[PDB]
Short mmCIF file of C-alpha atoms in Angstrom, two decimals:
data_model
loop_
_atom_site.label_atom_id
_atom_site.label_comp_id
_atom_site.label_asym_id
_atom_site.label_seq_id
_atom_site.Cartn_x
_atom_site.Cartn_y
_atom_site.Cartn_z
CA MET A 1 210.66 -6.54 59.70
CA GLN A 2 207.39 -4.76 59.02
CA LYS A 3 208.90 -3.36 55.85
CA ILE A 4 209.14 -7.06 54.59
CA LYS A 5 206.09 -8.20 56.08
CA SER A 6 203.67 -5.07 54.39
CA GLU A 7 205.83 -6.21 50.75
CA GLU A 8 204.61 -9.97 50.54
CA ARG A 9 201.82 -10.61 48.31
CA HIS A 10 200.42 -14.12 48.86
CA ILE A 11 197.64 -15.63 46.37
CA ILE A 12 194.71 -17.52 47.02
CA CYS A 13 193.22 -18.96 43.64
CA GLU A 14 190.43 -20.94 43.62
CA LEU A 15 189.34 -23.10 40.34
CA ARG A 16 186.81 -25.47 40.27
CA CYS A 17 185.81 -28.31 37.15
CA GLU A 18 183.15 -30.76 36.58
CA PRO A 19 183.78 -34.30 37.98
CA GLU A 20 185.06 -35.75 34.74
CA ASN A 21 187.48 -33.51 34.40
CA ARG A 22 188.87 -33.71 38.04
CA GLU A 23 192.20 -35.74 36.98
CA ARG A 24 192.96 -33.98 34.32
CA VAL A 25 192.57 -30.62 35.69
CA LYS A 26 194.72 -31.65 38.57
CA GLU A 27 197.59 -33.36 36.63
CA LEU A 28 197.63 -29.62 34.68
CA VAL A 29 197.68 -27.47 37.68
CA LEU A 30 200.43 -29.69 39.06
CA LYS A 31 202.63 -28.43 36.13
CA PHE A 32 202.53 -24.60 37.66
CA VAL A 33 204.20 -26.35 40.82
CA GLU A 34 208.09 -26.68 40.77
CA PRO A 35 208.35 -24.24 37.85
CA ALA A 36 206.18 -21.61 39.98
CA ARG A 37 208.95 -22.54 42.96
CA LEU A 38 211.77 -22.20 40.63
CA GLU A 39 210.51 -18.34 39.94
CA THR A 40 213.29 -16.20 42.38
CA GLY A 41 210.96 -14.27 44.89
CA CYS A 42 208.49 -17.34 45.21
CA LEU A 43 208.00 -18.06 48.93
CA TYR A 44 205.62 -20.83 48.62
CA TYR A 45 203.31 -22.28 45.93
CA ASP A 46 200.90 -25.20 46.62
CA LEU A 47 198.03 -27.00 44.96
CA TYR A 48 194.92 -27.95 47.41
CA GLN A 49 191.82 -29.89 46.76
CA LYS A 50 188.98 -28.81 48.94
CA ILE A 51 187.75 -32.54 50.77
CA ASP A 52 183.57 -32.22 51.09
CA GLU A 53 184.04 -31.16 47.54
CA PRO A 54 186.45 -32.65 45.26
CA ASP A 55 185.91 -30.90 42.04
CA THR A 56 186.85 -27.45 43.86
CA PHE A 57 191.07 -26.52 43.89
CA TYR A 58 193.34 -23.96 45.38
CA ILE A 59 196.57 -22.73 44.49
CA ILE A 60 197.86 -20.61 47.57
CA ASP A 61 201.48 -19.19 47.12
CA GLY A 62 203.48 -16.47 48.25
CA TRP A 63 206.15 -14.10 46.59
CA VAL A 64 208.59 -11.75 48.19
CA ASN A 65 207.30 -8.74 46.57
CA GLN A 66 204.58 -7.13 44.11
CA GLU A 67 207.52 -7.46 41.29
CA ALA A 68 207.64 -10.99 41.81
CA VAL A 69 204.43 -11.48 41.73
CA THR A 70 203.47 -9.79 38.38
CA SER A 71 206.67 -11.39 36.79
CA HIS A 72 204.66 -14.63 37.64
CA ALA A 73 201.35 -13.47 36.30
CA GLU A 74 203.09 -12.50 33.10
CA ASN A 75 205.16 -15.62 32.70
CA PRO A 76 205.07 -17.27 29.40
CA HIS A 77 204.73 -20.96 31.34
CA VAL A 78 202.30 -19.88 33.52
CA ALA A 79 199.81 -18.17 30.14
CA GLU A 80 200.56 -21.61 28.43
CA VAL A 81 199.16 -23.75 31.25
CA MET A 82 196.52 -21.56 31.97
CA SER A 83 195.65 -21.74 28.17
CA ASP A 84 195.06 -25.46 28.51
CA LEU A 85 192.70 -25.20 31.80
CA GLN A 86 190.33 -22.41 30.54
CA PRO A 87 188.50 -25.03 28.72
CA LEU A 88 188.29 -27.68 31.46
CA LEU A 89 187.02 -24.90 34.08
CA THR A 90 183.73 -23.89 35.58
CA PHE A 91 184.69 -21.38 37.68
CA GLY A 92 187.57 -19.70 36.25
CA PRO A 93 190.91 -19.25 38.10
CA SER A 94 189.22 -16.86 40.82
CA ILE A 95 192.43 -14.84 42.28
CA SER A 96 192.70 -13.00 45.68
CA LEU A 97 195.77 -10.58 45.79
CA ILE A 98 196.69 -10.55 49.58
CA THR A 99 198.61 -8.61 52.22
CA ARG A 100 199.95 -10.30 55.68
CA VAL A 101 198.62 -8.36 58.50
CA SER A 102 200.27 -10.59 61.20
CA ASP A 103 203.84 -11.13 61.93
CA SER B 1 197.57 -36.17 52.89
CA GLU B 2 197.25 -36.56 56.69
CA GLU B 3 197.77 -32.63 56.90
CA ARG B 4 194.29 -30.08 57.01
CA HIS B 5 194.78 -26.99 55.38
CA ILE B 6 192.17 -24.23 55.74
CA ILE B 7 191.39 -21.14 54.18
CA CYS B 8 188.47 -18.63 56.53
CA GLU B 9 187.03 -15.92 54.85
CA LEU B 10 185.85 -12.78 56.66
CA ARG B 11 183.81 -9.75 55.99
CA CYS B 12 183.08 -6.67 57.64
CA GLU B 13 181.32 -2.96 56.97
CA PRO B 14 184.44 -0.72 55.70
CA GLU B 15 183.48 0.75 59.54
CA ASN B 16 184.31 -1.74 61.58
CA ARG B 17 187.87 -2.76 59.31
CA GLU B 18 190.02 -1.73 61.92
CA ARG B 19 188.30 -3.32 64.69
CA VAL B 20 188.07 -6.50 62.95
CA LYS B 21 191.38 -6.66 62.24
CA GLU B 22 192.39 -6.06 65.76
CA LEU B 23 190.12 -8.89 66.83
CA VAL B 24 191.27 -11.79 64.47
CA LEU B 25 194.86 -11.06 65.57
CA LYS B 26 193.73 -11.95 68.52
CA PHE B 27 193.77 -15.64 67.42
CA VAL B 28 197.42 -15.84 66.09
CA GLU B 29 199.75 -16.55 68.64
CA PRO B 30 197.49 -18.85 70.43
CA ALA B 31 196.60 -20.58 67.63
CA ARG B 32 200.17 -21.07 66.73
CA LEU B 33 201.00 -22.43 70.40
CA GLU B 34 198.16 -25.28 69.91
CA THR B 35 199.95 -28.63 69.48
CA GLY B 36 199.67 -29.70 66.03
CA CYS B 37 199.36 -26.32 64.47
CA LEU B 38 201.58 -25.83 61.36
CA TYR B 39 201.01 -22.47 60.51
CA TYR B 40 198.30 -19.48 61.03
CA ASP B 41 198.70 -16.00 59.23
CA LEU B 42 196.09 -13.05 59.05
CA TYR B 43 195.71 -11.30 55.77
CA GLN B 44 194.05 -8.70 53.99
CA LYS B 45 192.53 -8.53 50.57
CA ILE B 46 194.25 -5.65 48.60
CA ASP B 47 191.43 -4.40 46.42
CA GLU B 48 188.56 -5.25 48.87
CA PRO B 49 190.11 -4.03 52.34
CA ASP B 50 187.35 -5.33 53.86
CA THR B 51 187.97 -8.84 53.38
CA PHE B 52 190.27 -10.69 55.39
CA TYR B 53 191.40 -14.83 55.11
CA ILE B 54 193.14 -16.56 57.27
CA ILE B 55 195.41 -19.55 56.09
CA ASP B 56 196.46 -21.94 58.85
CA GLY B 57 197.64 -25.25 58.80
CA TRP B 58 197.21 -28.45 60.96
CA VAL B 59 199.66 -31.73 61.34
CA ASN B 60 196.30 -34.07 61.33
CA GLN B 61 191.98 -34.10 61.32
CA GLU B 62 192.94 -34.36 65.15
CA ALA B 63 194.57 -31.04 65.90
CA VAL B 64 192.36 -29.05 63.71
CA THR B 65 189.33 -29.70 65.18
CA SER B 66 190.34 -29.63 68.66
CA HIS B 67 191.42 -26.38 67.45
CA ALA B 68 187.79 -25.84 66.07
CA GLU B 69 186.61 -26.54 69.69
CA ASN B 70 189.25 -24.23 71.67
CA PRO B 71 187.44 -21.83 74.18
CA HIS B 72 189.86 -18.99 72.74
CA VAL B 73 188.48 -19.47 69.69
CA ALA B 74 185.05 -19.70 71.05
CA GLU B 75 185.79 -16.28 72.80
CA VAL B 76 186.95 -14.46 69.92
CA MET B 77 184.49 -15.76 67.71
CA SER B 78 181.69 -14.67 70.39
CA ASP B 79 183.57 -10.64 69.94
CA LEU B 80 183.76 -10.84 66.16
CA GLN B 81 180.22 -12.65 65.22
CA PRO B 82 178.32 -9.11 65.53
CA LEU B 83 181.09 -7.15 63.35
CA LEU B 84 180.85 -9.74 60.68
CA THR B 85 178.65 -9.00 57.09
CA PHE B 86 180.02 -12.36 56.35
CA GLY B 87 181.30 -16.22 57.79
CA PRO B 88 183.84 -17.03 59.10
CA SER B 89 183.93 -19.04 56.05
CA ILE B 90 185.58 -21.99 56.32
CA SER B 91 187.08 -24.24 53.47
CA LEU B 92 188.42 -27.37 54.74
CA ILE B 93 191.58 -28.26 51.92
CA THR B 94 193.92 -31.21 52.01
CA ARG B 95 197.29 -30.40 50.00
CA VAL B 96 197.65 -32.43 46.08
CA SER B 97 200.55 -33.22 44.72
CA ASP B 98 202.31 -36.34 43.96
#
């Protein structure tokens, strides 16, 4: 159960854009959602928006293990959406790979 | 929409890494028992272990506010504050979707 916990990999990914591209950025990032959840080792995957700074988005997702999150980062559909997103971003996806300490 | 989620970042000096981890864990079970708590978990950044994140969700604004005002939270925060070099930096966010 502790080997299960420690094997998980979670990701916080921060993205920011200019006010004018807020709707377009939101639309693109949503595309990552359902396909990511269908990836087999995906525990969860959700897009969030900062309440006081709507130009700031966070993607929070969890994976069964390193291999699942790595397979996810290498996914063609992820790269394809990332390609369209990059030019709209003022703060490029800032990724934090983390592990769960709490049971 | 009504939900409120929080990303809370904390950083410490390498030397207090274990002590900071022990204290933050104390927020865990009591937070999960708070009415309106959807989830509450502590994480550590893999490549920078001196950085922790607390990710928690609440049913609504009232629940998260009641949480921020909780005495147990303040007590643990009192012990933690001197061990921290950064934060607790809080980002209040809402789940985007369609």
